[PDB]
Design a protein around this ligand. Sequence first.
Ligand SMILES: C[C@H]1CCC[C@H](O)CCCCCc2cc(O)cc(O)c2C(=O)O1
Length: 272
Amino acid sequence: QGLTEEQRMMIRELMDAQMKTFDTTFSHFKNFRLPGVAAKWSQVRKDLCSLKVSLQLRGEDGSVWNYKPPADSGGKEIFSLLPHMADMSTYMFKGIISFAKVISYFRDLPIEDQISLLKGAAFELCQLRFNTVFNAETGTWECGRLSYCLEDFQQLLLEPMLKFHYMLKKLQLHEEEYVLMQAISLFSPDRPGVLQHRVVDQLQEQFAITLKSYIECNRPQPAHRFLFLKIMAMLTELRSINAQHTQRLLRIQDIHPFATPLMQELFGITGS
Ligand SMILES: C[C@H]1CCC[C@H](O)CCCCCc2cc(O)cc(O)c2C(=O)O1
């Protein structure tokens, strides 16, 4: 530990906010919907089938419910999982909003910038949180009583969202590094509508400096050489994935509405 007291303060506050707002066992994700018991269109079908997962639900009693999805057959069967995705996204978004609200640097910003920043980074922070429950040996997001398994190989790693999760997992990051990644991405001075550009940008530079310093003080191994720079590269990829997934959500929403009120707020949809 070769960190200043201000740096150690910074990490402690981020770890504290994370502890208070990340429900790592997904105990409070309840009441969710489940799948039941024209070139815009080949595109939306292209958009959807890029992520095919089976779904598993462990009962508090030992029973297991298990869902294998339909093959693509040219109709509305690719839409059966969207309400559940939306309920999960919404649940994750709430934890992310609570995370920002606990952070002092975030609270001190004007409220119009708090909103602009949350709109910009919510998806990225959710992806970063999801990577900590991702099991790269089994292709599985383990969310408590609830598992999302990738369905059958290396063609799968061609999907950028999936390549990002495998690569980020291989770096074997600490809890401290994940939360500093959340901070850096949350405090991004160039999101649409940010007014305090210079303030946000100085905050960002401090969170990045803390992370570089944390790595230099606690990871001397030749396996973590350039680790800080690999992390910054992943954050750049993640912002690109973020933009690609936003256009792809809006295309689907344009022809089959599914977004919850909170998703509409975050993605700028007004209800008219
Ligand atoms: C566990 C989470 C990881 C998303 C990570 C990345 O977004 C990977 C994309 C995999 C999405 C898996 C998934 C499919 C689905 O139909 C409904 C869902 O709620 C999820 C889902 O919640 O995936």
